[PDB]
Design a protein around this ligand. Structure first.
Ligand code: CLA
Ligand code: CLA
Ligand code: CLA
Ligand code: CLA
Ligand code: CLA
Ligand code: CLA
Ligand code: CLA
Ligand code: CLA
Ligand SMILES: CCCCCCCCCCCCCCCC(=O)OC[C@H](COP(=O)(O)OC[C@@H](O)CO)OC(=O)CCCCCCCCCCCCCCC
Ligand SMILES: CC1=C(C/C=C(\C)CCC[C@H](C)CCC[C@H](C)CCCC(C)C)C(=O)c2ccccc2C1=O
Ligand code: SF4
Ligand code: SF4
Lengths: 142, 293, 146, 81, 75, 75, 61, 30, 146
């Protein structure tokens, strides 16, 4: 299976004056995310935490504190500027985990070989009433 | 003790005030009711209720405090006791819907009302006629000068013989009759309340209804209805009520949230009933002229 | 964050970096006793001059009693934090890196043993500070506006 | 598992839920039970914030992706601090 | 805004407006009570809402009736 | 809060701890100062003007029209 | 010099278990002692009214 | 007499010990 | 609407003024003028710049009822998403203030949940609605004791 992930290097981040929406103490303790993209031309975009910063030529890198933020920019880049991007997760110790395409292909289209975790093969009206699951660890949907 | 001496001109007192933020003109203002410092006037109407049911000094109240304090201590024991092994009931014990309804109907509702009748005619009624009866001496005094006979013979027609006169003073012997059970229905002229001797009769009457209503359901002795059977049998022919009440026994007897719902509905009604009856038929002496209460 | 004049400047970065809470290289017992001195001597005023006894001749000794208690309550609120935010054998949670990047020692204050020392410093200093106000303000008491 | 996301068999493979997940939970896998021959799948339920927009874009009889809110974690609560 | 137009109404009736004697002494509409009664929240209830709503409340049967109805209708 | 504290002290029979002119005092001086300036402006800082630009400045005299006060200095 | 003078004279108040006990128990005793032995001339409640009582409406009830 | 002792105890001390007792129990970790 | 009706009908009876209810109780301004506004004259004078009375405590509780009730609206009307964005700014300011970044929350601060606000909002509304009426009911009747 041809899925060797991207293996994040250390590249130069975009020009920005810095804002109050950057990381907080959560980064130093739990986790924080980086999203590495490559541009062909040095333009100006808008940051998820408000304000505008200018991407520079080629390999960028930029750290954000959540996953909704990495993707929220990730949609804008892929849509407005027709440009590729991944993102990761970085742990306090230093272990970095590959996140977004997860196979090399965006989740919108279908790869022959991903799993089927989390499916019920029955219509929704056929769930079991809450009396049939009482005093158990089960739920109706489970 | 003072309020008793004149119920219509002495504000009942709830407790004392000790608030170290009070200035001086407030300390004066909240000193009332014939106290020595600030107090709160009691509007819960306890003072009249304990007057009626026979309490007469402070000392009755202190033992009244201790006893209830002891009863509270007893209950706390029980809540702990029935959690250890070898003292916790099993499921089938709680789900015994028949043997419970006999005791609750016959023992809980029933005997308690009979015993409250006992107190009304051994302490309360004698109190309102100047007789002070207490645990020290309640064996000498007779509730009716021929007591405990006339009931056995069958001529119960003597306990309603000579009731309290119309010109009666609630705390003394003037006009004090000797009847213990009556049926008068009016008001006590002086205190604007229901007569004592009616309320004794009524708790005696409904002491019987529940006792006889208590032996309906079958527990261990082969007689009496089965509540499961009664629900099944009432299935109207013609189908307008479908299968009727079939199967409602288990659904109620297995759903706590069902049983609670019914309890609240019944409790919700009678509380409104209590509110509606108390203000029209004042059951405590000197409570229809304490307007705020 | 951002580097504005307020968050970084020689005057600012010298004022903060040289008061007991930040002198990361001295014993937390003293860092508690200085803190309790400045705070204790501070709040004796408003209790004595604005309390409910300011008119009475006991305004001196009713403010001091008030300030003494408030120091005691904060001493409890201090100990509750120290006993619920640190474990008896767990190391310090203070940052060990300076702005230049020199990895310095972790602050002993951010430590169960250290904080329990610090509150001992605060409490003793707090009462000592609040008596020192009372002595001055009602012995050496001329110039003041009281 | 923080929240539980479940996808039923009614799903017609329209890829409208996947495109509307703001934190990349759902994804598309092959099937054989539709004309489109693909059904959605939720293999990353941890990061599921609970924003029901994932199933405000499932155009079926009742629904084919359903979201049940369970306990909340530090990422399922979307805390940035 | 509401407290501003409350502040204006009470201050002017209590400190400014009002008739004037021929002799020269001035008697304001509310007798100059703003300076003492407006500092307590209960003061704004007794002497402003309760005491200056008399005219609207008993405005039935005279030309000011239409205000009596609107007062209720706006509630 | 000052309103709440005022109300609490008044309720407890301590009208000498309220915030009022007859107790602990809070005088607006800055408004009282600027009122003073506009009262003496006709003297120096605006020699053309016969009188102040208004009558609510902390000085002057009322204007009576038909037994009804127009304005007077607002304290 | 101030280090050594302060270091020994604040040691008893430092063990957090003991500091918590003495603060509440000692303090709670002190609050008790101050109010039970305050002058009546500084606490209005602690002194009585010592003034006649005003009757209520409708007699005294 | 007796109120002047029992009112503070239930108003000041008994709250303080209560709040400080719960705060440790709520914030424990095992 | 039930307790209102019981009180006014009886409060006219006890005074022997039964005509007042029997005419005013057919138009709404009669209930607002002759029951609410009229009977609260003695209550609101519990304390004024002239003095206080026994009724002061009921006058205080009366307003205290109005205050909790009006706080109830705050939780019913303003819903959660607004406050959550407000906390995040605050939880940033606290994380950058010197001398105050030394204290760290053990449990992260978040705005109340959607259901909790409804429950909390209703708790205030009910409490304020009981205390308000309970004060007016007792003070107005006990003021006249008739
Ligand atoms: C004469 C007997 C008697 C009396 C006076 C009471 C009286 C009472 N019972 Mg009861 N109870 C009884 C027999 C009785 N029960 C029997 C025989 C059973 C077994 C079926 C129960 C099972 C029972 C339960 C399960 C509960 C009570 C409860 C109660 C109290 C409400 C009340 C004091 C309730 C209570 O308050 O518990 C203390 C309650 O939850 N009772
Ligand atoms: C559960 C309630 C209850 C209890 C425990 C008692 C208990 C007692 N009653 Mg009694 N009594 C009661 C209800 C009760 N009564 C009622 C409701 C009436 C009204 C008819 C009476 C009328 C009554 C009379 C007339 C007499 C007793 C007597 C007695 C005592 C001896 C009984 C043999 C005994 C202390 C007899 C006795 O000697 O007691 C002083 C007695 O003469 N009682
Ligand atoms: C309905 C029952 C009932 C009730 C509620 C009362 C209530 C009262 N009686 Mg009374 N009384 C009653 C029946 C009742 N009486 C009967 C039937 C008689 C005739 C024998 C008397 C004879 C009587 C006298 C002679 C006196 C009272 C007194 C009193 C008052 C004080 C109570 C007291 O001192 O407790 C103390 C009670 C006892 C020491 C006896 C306890 C009896 C048993 C143990 C009670 C069982 C309760 C049970 C264990 C609850 C279990 C709870 C558990 C499920 C958690 C109080 C108003 C006294 C009074 O008026 O003022 C001083 C008084 O002197 N009563
Ligand atoms: C309600 C507010 C309030 C009040 C009434 C007082 C009252 C007082 N302060 Mg104080 N103070 C306050 C707030 C207050 N303070 C605050 C907020 C600070 C900030 C740290 C200070 C810092 C301070 C110092 C540093 C000193 C005083 C001192 C004094 C006393 C002399 C005042 C003087 O000369 O001018 C006086 C009792 C002086 C003193 O010795 O107190 C007795 C003194 O040296 N105050
Ligand atoms: C939105 C409400 C609002 C606001 C913002 C103000 C604001 C102000 N009023 Mg004001 N006022 C209001 C409502 C309001 N008022 C209402 C409803 C009335 C009742 C009619 C008044 C009656 C009133 C009077 C009678 C006066 C003011 C004055 C002033 C100014 C005080 C100037 C000062 O001391 O600073 C100056 C600060 C410095 C010099 C240093 C900083 C100030 C700008 C005074 C003023 O400025 O007169 C021009 C003045 O005389 N006001
Ligand atoms: C800073 C406040 C201030 C303001 C708002 C005004 C306002 C005005 N001045 Mg003025 N004035 C001021 C200070 C001020 N003056 C001072 C400090 C002086 C020095 C004595 C003057 C001297 C002055 C003169 C000499 C004249 C004015 C005039 C005027 C008016 C044109 C106008 C009303 C003129 C005037 O009278 O307008 C009618 C005019 O002739 N002013
Ligand atoms: C649960 C019912 C209840 C309630 C609501 C109150 C309420 C009150 N009690 Mg009280 N009390 C009760 C039961 C109750 N008591 C019992 C059962 C006892 C017997 C031990 C006492 C003994 C008692 C004393 C000795 C005093 C009060 C006092 C007070 C008042 C101040 C609160 C306080 O310090 O109490 C503390 C309550 C306890 C220690 C009992 C807890 C069990 C307050 C009105 C004080 C007072 O009158 O203030 C003016 C006062 O001096 N109470
Ligand atoms: C419920 C119990 C309770 C008790 C017993 C007290 C008791 C007291 N309060 Mg208090 N208070 C309470 C609850 C209580 N408060 C609550 C819940 C609040 C919040 C609304 C307040 C807010 C409050 C304020 C704002 C003030 C008081 C003050 C006081 C003191 C009265 C004034 C005096 O003569 O001091 C005489 C004694 C002294 C001046 C020295 C203090 C002695 C210490 C306590 C020992 C007294 C110690 C006043 C006070 O003394 O503070 C300085 C004061 O200013 N209290
Ligand atoms: C609690 C409050 C709601 C329940 C109290 C009312 C119960 C239902 C009342 C009608 C109960 C009811 O209607 O049942 C009466 C009867 C149904 O009888 P049953 O089905 O119980 O058994 C009778 C026959 O079916 C077999 O012999 O229906 C008719 O006779 C038709 C004529 C109806 C027209 C006359 C009645 C018009 C009203
Ligand atoms: C003010 C407010 C808050 C803020 C309230 C917070 C953050 C909690 C309250 C702050 C402290 C805990 C005050 C507690 C004081 C009480 C006396 C505590 C008693 C327990 C919300 O979180 C919220 C959420 C949803 C709808 C409306 C609202 C809302 O109106
Ligand atoms: S709730 Fe949001 S995060 Fe969860 S699956 Fe739906 S869209 Fe994705
Ligand atoms: S939106 Fe619904 S139908 Fe469309 S792909 Fe998702 S689950 Fe299937």
């Amino acid at each position: 299976g041809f899925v060797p992930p991207q293996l994040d290097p250390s590249t130069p981040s975009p020009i920005f004056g810095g804002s109050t929406g950057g990381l907080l103490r959560k980064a130093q303790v739990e986790e924080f995310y980086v999203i590495t993209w490559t541009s062909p031309k040095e333009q100006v975009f808008e940051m998820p935490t408000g304000g505008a910063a200018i991407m520079r030529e080629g390999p960028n890198l930029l750290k954000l504190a959540r996953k909704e933020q990495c993707l929220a920019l990730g949609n804008r880049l892929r849509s407005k500027y027709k440009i590729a991007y991944q993102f990761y997760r970085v742990f306090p110790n230093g272990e970095v985990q590959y996140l977004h395409p997860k196979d090399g292909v965006y989740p919108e289209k279908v790869n022959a070989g991903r799993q089927g975790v989390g499916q019920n093969f029955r219509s929704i009206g056929k769930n079991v009433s809450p009396i049939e699951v009482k005093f158990t660890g089960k739920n109706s949907f489970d | 003790e003072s309020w008793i001496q004149d119920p219509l001109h002495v504000r009942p007192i709830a407790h004392a005030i000790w608030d170290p933020h009070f200035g001086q003109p407030a300390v004066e203002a909240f000193t009332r009711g014939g106290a020595a410092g600030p107090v709160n006037i009691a509007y819960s109407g306890v003072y009249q209720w304990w007057y009626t049911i026979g309490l007469r000094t402070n000392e009755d109240l202190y033992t009244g405090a201790l006893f209830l304090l002891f009863l509270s201590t007893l209950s706390l024991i029980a809540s702990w006791l029935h959690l250890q092994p070898k003292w916790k009931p099993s499921l089938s014990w709680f789900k015994n819907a028949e043997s419970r309804l006999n005791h609750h109907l016959s023992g809980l509702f029933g005997v308690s009302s009979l015993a409250w009748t006992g107190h009304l005619v051994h302490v309360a009624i004698p109190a309102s006629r100047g007789e002070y009866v207490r645990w020290n001496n309640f064996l000498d005094v007779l509730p009716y000068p021929q007591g405990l006979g006339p009931l056995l013979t069958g001529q119960w027609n003597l306990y309603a013989q000579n009731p309290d006169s119309s010109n009666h003073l609630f705390g003394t012997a003037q006009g004090a009759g000797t009847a213990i059970l009556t049926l008068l229905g009016g008001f006590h002229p002086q205190t604007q309340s229901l007569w004592l001797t009616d309320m004794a009769h009524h708790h005696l009457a409904i002491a019987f209804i529940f006792l006889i209503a208590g032996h309906m359901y079958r527990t261990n002795f082969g007689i009496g209805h089965s509540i499961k059977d009664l629900l099944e049998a009432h299935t109207p022919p013609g189908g307008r009520l479908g299968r009727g009440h079939k199967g409602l026994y288990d659904t109620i007897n297995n759903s706590i949230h069902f049983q609670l719902g019914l309890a609240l509905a019944s409790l919700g009604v009678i509380t409104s009933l209590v509110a509606q009856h108390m203000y029209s038929l004042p059951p405590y002496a000197f409570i229809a002229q304490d307007f705020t209460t | 964050s951002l580097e504005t004049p307020v968050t970084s400047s020689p005057l600012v970065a010298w004022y903060l970096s040289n008061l007991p809470a930040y002198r990361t290289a001295v014993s937390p017992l003293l860092r508690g006793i200085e803190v309790g001195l400045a705070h204790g001597y501070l709040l004796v005023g408003p209790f004595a001059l604005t309390g409910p006894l300011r008119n009475t001749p006991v305004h001196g000794q009713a403010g001091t009693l008030g300030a003494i208690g408030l120091v005691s309550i904060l001493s409890v609120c201090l100990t509750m934090y120290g006993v619920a935010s640190f474990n008896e054998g767990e190391p310090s949670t203070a940052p060990v890196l300076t702005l230049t990047g020199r990895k310095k020692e972790a602050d002993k204050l951010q430590t169960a043993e250290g904080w329990s020392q610090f509150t001992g410093g605060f409490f003793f200093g707090g009462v000592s500070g609040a008596v020192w106000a009372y002595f001055l303000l009602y012995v050496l008491d001329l110039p003041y506006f009281f | 598992m923080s929240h539980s996301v479940k996808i039923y068999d009614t799903c017609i493979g329209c890829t409208q839920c996947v495109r509307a997940c703001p934190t990349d939970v759902l994804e598309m896998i092959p099937w054989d039970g539709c004309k489109a021959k693909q059904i959605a799948s939720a293999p990353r339920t941890e990061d599921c914030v609970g924003c029901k927009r994932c199933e405000s874009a499932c155009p079926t009889d009742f629904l084919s992706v359903r979201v049940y809110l369970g306990p909340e974690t530090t990422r399922s609560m979307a805390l940035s601090y | 805004i509401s407290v501003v137009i409350f502040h204006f109404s009470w201050k002017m009736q209590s400190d400014v407006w009002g008739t004037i004697s021929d002799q020269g002494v001035v008697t304001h509409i509310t007798g100059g009570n703003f300076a003492q009664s407006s500092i307590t929240i209960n003061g704004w209830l007794r002497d402003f809402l309760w005491a200056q709503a008399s005219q609207v409340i008993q405005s039935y049967g005279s030309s000011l009736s239409a205000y009596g109805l609107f007062f209720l209708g706006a509630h | 809060g000052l309103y709440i504290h005022n109300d609490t002290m008044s309720a407890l029979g301590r009208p000498q701890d309220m915030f009022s002119d007859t107790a602990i005092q809070l005088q607006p001086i800055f408004a009282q100062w600027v009122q003073n300036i506009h009262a003496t402006a006709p003297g120096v800082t605006a020699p053309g003007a016969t009188t102040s630009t208004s009558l609510t400045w902390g000085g002057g005299e009322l204007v009576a029209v038909g037994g009804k006060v127009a304005l007077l200095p607002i304290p | 010099l101030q280090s050594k003078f302060f270091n020994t004279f604040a040691a008893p108040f430092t063990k957090r278990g003991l500091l918590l006990k003495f603060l509440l128990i000692g303090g709670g005793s002190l609050v008790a002692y101050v109010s039970a032995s305050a002058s009546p001339d500084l606490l209005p409640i602690k002194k009585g009214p010592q003034l006649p009582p005003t009757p209520g409406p409708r007699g005294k009830i | 007499n007796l109120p002047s002792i029992f009112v503070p105890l239930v108003g000041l001390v008994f709250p303080a010990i209560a709040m400080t007792s719960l705060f440790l129990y709520v914030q424990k970790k095992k | 609407w039930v307790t209102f009706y019981w009180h006014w009908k009886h409060i006219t009876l006890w005074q022997g003024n039964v005509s007042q209810f029997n005419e005013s109780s057919t138009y709404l301004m009669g209930w607002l003028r002759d029951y609410l506004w009229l009977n609260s004259s003695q209550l609101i004078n519990g304390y004024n710049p002239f003095g206080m009375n026994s009724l002061s405590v009921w006058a205080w509780m009366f307003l205290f009822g109005h205050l909790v009730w009006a706080t109830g609206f705050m939780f019913l009307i303003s819903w959660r998403g607004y406050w959550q964005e407000l906390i995040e700014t605050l939880a940033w300011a606290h994380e950058r203030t010197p001398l105050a970044n030394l204290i760290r929350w053990r449990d992260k601060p978040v705005a109340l949940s959607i259901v909790q606000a409804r429950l909390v909002g209703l708790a205030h509304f009910s409490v304020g609605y009981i205390f308000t009426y309970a004060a007016f009911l007792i003070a107005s009747t006990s003021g006249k004791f008739g």
